[PDB]
Design a protein around this ligand. Sequence first.
Ligand SMILES: *[C@@H]1O[C@H](CO)[C@@H](O)[C@H](O)[C@H]1NC(C)=O
Ligand SMILES: O=C([O-])C(=O)[O-]
Ligand SMILES: [Cu+2]
Ligand SMILES: [Cu+2]
Length: 691
Amino acid sequence: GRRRSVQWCAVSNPEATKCFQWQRNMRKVRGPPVSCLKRDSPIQCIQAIAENRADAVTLDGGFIYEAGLAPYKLRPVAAEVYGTERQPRTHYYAVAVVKKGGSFQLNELQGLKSCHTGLRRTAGWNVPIGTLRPFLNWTGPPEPIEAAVARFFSASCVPGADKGQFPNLCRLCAGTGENKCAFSSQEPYFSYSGAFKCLKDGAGDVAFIRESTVFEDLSDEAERDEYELLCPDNTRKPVDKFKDCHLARVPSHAVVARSVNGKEDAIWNLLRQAQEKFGKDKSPKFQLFGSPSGQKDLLFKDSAIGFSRVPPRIDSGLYLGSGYFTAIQNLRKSEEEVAARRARVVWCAVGEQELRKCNQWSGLSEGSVTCSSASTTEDCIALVLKGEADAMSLDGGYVYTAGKCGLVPVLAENYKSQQSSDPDPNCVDRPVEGYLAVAVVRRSDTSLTWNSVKGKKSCHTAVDRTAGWNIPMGLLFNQTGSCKFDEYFSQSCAPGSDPRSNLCALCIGDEQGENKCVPNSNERYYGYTGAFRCLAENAGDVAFVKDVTVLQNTDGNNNEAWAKDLKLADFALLCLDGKRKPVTEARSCHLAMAPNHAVVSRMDKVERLKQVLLHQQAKFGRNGSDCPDKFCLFQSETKNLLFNDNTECLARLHGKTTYEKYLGPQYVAGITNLKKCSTSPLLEACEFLRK
Ligand SMILES: *[C@@H]1O[C@H](CO)[C@@H](O)[C@H](O)[C@H]1NC(C)=O
Ligand SMILES: O=C([O-])C(=O)[O-]
Ligand SMILES: [Cu+2]
Ligand SMILES: [Cu+2]
């Protein structure tokens, strides 16, 4: 014997106590069971959990950060919900409270006295210190920002600060003895309520807390009136103007568990039942979101209204946000190092071949481009959200996903026009024309037509790209109305599907029979060239590609082994009408017009990304000053690494700077429908992070 429960990590006595009561009432209702572990702080809870001696603990975004780092790598599993029942939210506001009577704004705090919730806390430290960075005159590492803050304000209360080294910072703490400035209840000016008390008692001039404290601690309304908020536009507004007067909107506290053998189920079952039974006003036996007249926020935030489960794709950095995550990292960086990182463009390369070319581009960018890599597009989009990568060129199917995630289209791949000019000097403002999606078959299969394609073997670029999957499956879906995308064709090579499905049946992995059905250039049947090879080698009977693919790959246009003897004349296109036409008539024989591949980024990098890309292609583009002498960005010769080998240039968007404006209504309308049949972990993660 041992236990059978979820072991909660208490970080204090009054917390072990309530944990205990929580344990009792779980039993006494025959609900899921919680056992309790004891520690003196959040980090100890972090390590206990990582060594398996507690299962979970609810932490402040500052400790979510900390906890994600190796060697811990804990993951947020359930977020606290605040606001109300019908105006519930998984975020809170970092505000700056002051008393009415003075007139000093957020830019005039030097030499004032401040009250903070705790060292490394979202609203008490990370946000305000980051907001005042520009007035601290901090020289950067190795002098801790602390020393810069200790010099900036006169005296402060900042629980957990090193009293030895940053005496000024513990200055205002009320604790008696070795308790003065503790990161615990011993220290009365601790957490939100202590920080507020600090201000209320007249000890500090500003309190750095959440929007709710004043309303939780001050009953009377007119009591509340003695205070006001310090807004970031150096204006003062009432404590109720938080939505229009906050330093930041940050993620709510969250329960973190191990990323490995986590017990997320358990934790989620326990939490769910507990909030049913013991939640917001509904069981005087026990109250999961209330604390003894002693206490404040024991185990969970007082007055949270419940839990919201975190989609399994979310890690600390996606939980935290590009914004907040980066802001925490920056606190440990010189401002030159921070300014260099913003000037630099970090490319996300999908697989090894693309990383190779990126390295090559990198060494020649004169430090303006650097590389990052993932093994799928979704992993690359997850690195750009985390701010660890910045850009990649994507298929319109990916433009939608990135877009539901908050990324915007910056420049689009411009291909040879419906002919406007020749080696076109205005390829940059020339509006994009789209690409044609076509179904290619062997000329000799005289019998094969659009209406007899179903049930045969197919070859697709990858799951979720326009020509290779949204178009063909969309068109099919629209007739049958079946979500069983694996019965449309009997055997396929659709990279990114279950390696065990029929949809991976014809894939061949790399040169060695590995990487079977992976959605990166590791699989030989991947992307446009690879969907085509699949056909040219009688693996499949149809290949969903773009017209240009066959030209580029037959008639010695490609002389890779497999391509060498193919002749354009052995292939034909299936038209919707039941006909068949030669490849040269794709203009009047296509499934549909696909939106151009586009490079996407975070909104914060748009302008610098534009700058960089216009300059780099000027040098390495099509009739680029260094190409082919030195480097051609738009050539990997039939492999389309980073960009399509046929990009004439990167063109402006002509105001379609939204995935919806860029993709168009029919288009969004259609991936939406297809997406119901099944969503991805990644749209599930952003659905959550958007809210
Ligand atoms: C920041 O630097 C400026 C001078 O260039 C100065 O006015 C200010 O006092 C400095 N910093 C502190 C102590 O916050
Ligand atoms: O459109 C497609 O199929 C692609 O870009 O792979
Ligand atoms: Cu907090
Ligand atoms: Cu495409």
